[PDB]
Design a protein around this ligand. Structure first.
Ligand SMILES: *[C@@H]1O[C@H](CO)[C@@H](O)[C@H](O)[C@H]1NC(C)=O
Ligand SMILES: CCCCCCCCCCCCCC
Ligand SMILES: CCCCCCCCCCCC
Ligand SMILES: CCCCCCCCCCCC
Ligand SMILES: CCCCCCCCCCCC
Ligand SMILES: CCCCCCCCCC
Ligand SMILES: CCCCCCCCCC
Ligand SMILES: CCCCCCCCC
Ligand SMILES: CCCCCCCC
Ligand SMILES: CCCCCCCC
Ligand SMILES: CCCCCCCC
Ligand SMILES: CCCCCCCC
Ligand SMILES: CCCCCCC
Ligand SMILES: CCCCCCC
Ligand SMILES: CCCCCC
Ligand SMILES: [Cl-]
Ligand code: NA
Ligand code: NA
Length: 552
């Protein structure tokens, strides 16, 4: 048959908007900004945004629309050599789906804990509370060893943090059921009803932004919001000399935009050929980066309020790692009237934000993997078993991040697996193939035919110059000034853990060289002839079904 198009352009926007607006905006951005100083994170953030985030996102969407193919076969059409970009993106999205559902497991645990008379993270007189704990309101009335009740709940009850990754501990069975529950929700929403949220499109889309608005109003009116905002906005120039703020800000844009994963290319292949996706991507790009910037005001206002309440520095009031959104927002919902009611909504809001993202990504890899075996899969019961097998195996590897030492494994996955140099590796090669091998101007001819007009030179120069320079420059300077990964500024990772972390990165990075070697070996002839034949596009726009032109 053929790849079914979208019912209407409104479905493309909502599927895309729900695919990369979520935990990457409200969870990962606040703590990466928090970890890398304050506002010094924003300069590389906006530089990378306007240089390579929107351009690469639009490039992925337009490649999918031009080839009408998934993550992998689109690159086979565009350039048979360097086809390893698709396999690299599939590996990256597999690892991402592995560790990205643990966040939803934690959110589900918090939501289940929210159903009681008093929030468990309001006061600290429970079993898990260390005698070092003290009420935040009593912190000033009452050195550097008085933990807040909110941080204890995260490290003592929700995570049961162990001494280190070398100390796995026991599998938190309460979190293991929550991790299983969200996977069953993902499994039941992937097999039956791939896109079945059509009845509640209005509620499931406007509510997460409606809930984020209340958090912003509550945070901004807090007494300490002034100091938190100045920390969030005003930059520190000396921090820009560190290569880590550029890697974090550069790959946060790539993470938040879901690029180098094959999801955007697949989502871009479901719309009509003669559809102006250039305008809609720019609007969706504003909605994505706008949500991260605006929601950053809310979380950093609470951080400023917490610092004033506890009489501590803003940079030391919460966790410099994952769980900042689980320390700040659960503190904000305490301050609201009827804290239990608002706590339920936030973790429901946090869960729909991530479930929609997980649906797009998990369906993204499964569709991409089916394209490799179109007859073996997507045919009868064979898709039943394969979907469950992917969900089951990716759930078992998610169990290693649920044990008491599972937080340290989560930091390794979040820093190496689907972020960091692995994303810079794929993003550079996506732009290098299009801009220099395929041709930047050679693709504008396709885009002009496809969207109706020739775009400006912003996209062309971003692929040709800015993105390779930003990706290579951040890659070279990161290895030159090597700083090993740390958890919460204190824990130092053992050598094997870093080596394990690089294996997660290098497993997808080496997909590009391996396929080049595989393709060169398969093709017969002189080496220069072998390279020449594998670089020629094989009719990317092979879809007469629609009024189209030709690749040349
Ligand atoms: C907290 O640290 C202070 C200063 O070192 C020390 O005097 C006090 O005994 C500590 N209290 C607890 C509960 O550990
Ligand atoms: C009246 C209640 C709302 C108060 C909002 C406070 C906003 C503070 C703005 C500080 C900006 C600093 C930029 C460097
Ligand atoms: C803010 C840093 C990145 C901005 C990239 C804009 C590039 C515009 C195209 C230049 C044409 C000469
Ligand atoms: C997990 C290790 C990498 C798996 C993917 C390797 C790519 C092989 C492509 C073979 C077909 C050309
Ligand atoms: C700066 C890097 C330039 C790379 C040039 C590659 C040229 C390949 C041409 C293939 C045409 C089908
Ligand atoms: C390695 C992380 C889990 C990957 C499971 C799905 C991809 C492989 C299917 C055979
Ligand atoms: C900087 C982000 C917007 C770029 C649009 C203008 C491109 C410059 C040449 C007209
Ligand atoms: C529903 C929005 C919450 C805003 C809280 C304002 C507190 C004023 C006392
Ligand atoms: C054919 C590519 C399979 C990739 C699965 C992901 C393993 C890390
Ligand atoms: C809370 C979501 C705000 C979105 C703003 C979009 C325009 C910058
Ligand atoms: C690695 C220690 C925890 C084991 C949980 C299950 C892993 C397959
Ligand atoms: C793979 C580069 C860093 C590895 C550090 C630990 C090696 C055992
Ligand atoms: C990850 C959960 C998958 C369950 C499949 C049951 C057939
Ligand atoms: C992060 C991209 C590095 C490219 C190196 C090419 C040899
Ligand atoms: C000064 C803070 C305003 C925030 C608007 C989103
Ligand atoms: Cl973002
Ligand atoms: Na979403
Ligand atoms: Na995002």
């Amino acid at each position: 048959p053929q790849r079914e198009k979208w019912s209407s352009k409104i479905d493309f926007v909502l599927s895309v908007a729900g695919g990369f607006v979520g935990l990457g905006n409200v969870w990962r951005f606040p703590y990466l900004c928090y970890k890398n100083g304050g506002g010094a994170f924003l300069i590389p953030y906006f530089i990378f945004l306007f240089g390579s985030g929107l351009p690469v996102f639009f490039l992925e969407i337009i490649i999918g629309q031009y080839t009408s193919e998934g993550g992998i076969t689109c690159w086979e059409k565009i350039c048979p050599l360097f086809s390893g970009i698709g396999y690299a993106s599939v590996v990256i999205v597999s690892l991402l789906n592995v560790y990205y559902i643990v966040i939803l497991a934690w959110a589900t645990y918090y939501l289940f804990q929210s159903f009681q008379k008093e929030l468990p993270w309001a006061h600290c007189n429970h079993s898990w509370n260390t005698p070092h704990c003290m009420e935040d309101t009593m912190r000033k009335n009452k050195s550097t060893n008085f933990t807040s009740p909110v941080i204890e709940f995260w490290e003592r009850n929700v995570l049961s943090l162990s001494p280190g990754i070398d100390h796995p501990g026991s599998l938190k069975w309460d979190l293991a059921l929550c991790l299983l529950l969200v996977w069953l929700v993902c499994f039941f929403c992937i097999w039956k009803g791939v896109r079945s949220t059509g009845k509640v499109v209005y509620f499931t889309a406007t509510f997460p932004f409606a809930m984020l608005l209340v958090l912003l109003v509550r945070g901004l009116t807090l007494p300490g919001a002034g100091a938190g905002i100045k920390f969030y906005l005003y930059p520190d120039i000396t921090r820009l000399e560190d290569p880590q703020v550029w890697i974090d800000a550069g790959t946060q844009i790539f993470f938040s935009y879901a690029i180098c994963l094959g999801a955007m290319t697949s989502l871009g292949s479901y719309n009509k050929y003669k559809y102006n996706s250039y305008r809609d991507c720019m609007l969706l790009g504003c909605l994505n980066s706008g949500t991260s910037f605006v929601s950053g005001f809310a979380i950093f206002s609470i951080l400023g309020f917490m610092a004033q309440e506890q009489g501590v520095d803003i940079a030391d009031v919460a966790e410099s790692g994952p769980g900042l959104a689980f320390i700040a927002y659960p503190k904000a919902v305490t301050m609201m009237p009827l804290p239990t009611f608002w706590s339920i909504l936030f973790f429901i809001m946090l869960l729909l934000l991530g479930l929609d993202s997980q649906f797009v990504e998990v369906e993204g890899q499964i569709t991409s993997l089916v394209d490799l075996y179109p007859s073996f899969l997507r045919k009868g019961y064979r898709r039943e078993i394969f979907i469950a097998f992917v969900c089951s195996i990716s759930y078992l590897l998610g169990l290693t991040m649920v044990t008491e030492g599972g937080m340290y494994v989560f930091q390794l996955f979040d820093y190496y697996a689907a972020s960091g140099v692995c994303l810079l590796w794929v993003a550079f090669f996506e732009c290098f193939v299009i801009a220099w091998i395929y041709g930047g101007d050679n693709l504008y001819d396709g885009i002009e035919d496809m969207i109706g007009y020739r775009p400006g030179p912003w996209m062309k120069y971003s692929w040709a110059v800015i993105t390779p320079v930003l990706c290579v420059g951040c890659f070279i300077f990161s290895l030159v000034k090597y700083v090993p990964l740390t958890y919460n500024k204190t824990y130092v990772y053992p050598n094997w853990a870093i080596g394990l972390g690089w294996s997660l990165a290098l497993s997808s990075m080496l997909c590009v060289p391996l396929v080049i070697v595989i393709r060169l070996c398969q093709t017969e002839g002189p080496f220069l002839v072998r390279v020449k034949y594998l670089l020629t596009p094989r009719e990317p726009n092979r879809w007469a079904v629609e009024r189209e032109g030709a690749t040349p």
